[PDB]
Amino acid sequence: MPSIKLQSSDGEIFEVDVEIAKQSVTIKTMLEDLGMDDEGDDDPVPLPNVNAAILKKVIQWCTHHKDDPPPPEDDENKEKRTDDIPVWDQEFLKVDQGTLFELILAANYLDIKGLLDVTCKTVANMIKGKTPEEIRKTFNIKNDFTEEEEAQVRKENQWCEEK
Numbered sequence: 001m002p003s004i005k006l007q008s009s010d011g012e013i014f015e016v017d018v019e020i021a022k023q024s025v026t027i028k029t030m031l032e033d034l035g036m037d038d039e040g041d042d043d044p045v046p047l048p049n050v051n052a053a054i055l056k057k058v059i060q061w062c063t064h065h066k067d068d069p070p071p072p073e074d075d076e077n078k079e080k081r082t083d084d085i086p087v088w089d090q091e092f093l094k095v096d097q098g099t100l101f102e103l104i105l106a107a108n109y110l111d112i113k114g115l116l117d118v119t120c121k122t123v124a125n126m127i128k129g130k131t132p133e134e135i136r137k138t139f140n141i142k143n144d145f146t147e148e149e150e151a152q153v154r155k156e157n158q159w160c161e162e163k
Helices: 027-034 052-065 087-092 097-110 113-125 133-137
Strands: 005-006 014-015
Touching: 005 052, 014 052, 027 097, 052 087, 052 097, 087 097, 087 113, 097 113, 113 133
Parallel strands: none
Antiparallel strands: 005 014
């Protein structure tokens, strides 16, 4: 199996498995256009969007999501529609905002709405899971029956800190 060749904005080229990069939507067009996919260390095309600092996190997100643990025998699906986030994703929602912020934007121009949604859910989680504007707080964000709230329809909160 070959791999994807892409060069970050500052000139730091990255090579990694093409199956993971398949999650990146704007990469498939790039792959057919100037990718060719021959050996994987192919001619590097510069991407003026992200540098190697952020890109590694974005493409490693794709790393696990193509490799998510296959269903054993009884329950044949992975998820219905966003129900159980893997330990891979989990760590990216407890990190510094410097990386967390770009995780949304980096995903935007790559069209990985999967990545974008998970981090967006978490950023908006701290308020009320509503509109993700911090300026919303002027009118109290958006009423969402926070009077109840205790139902906690999520669980899986072991509170295992560190990484």
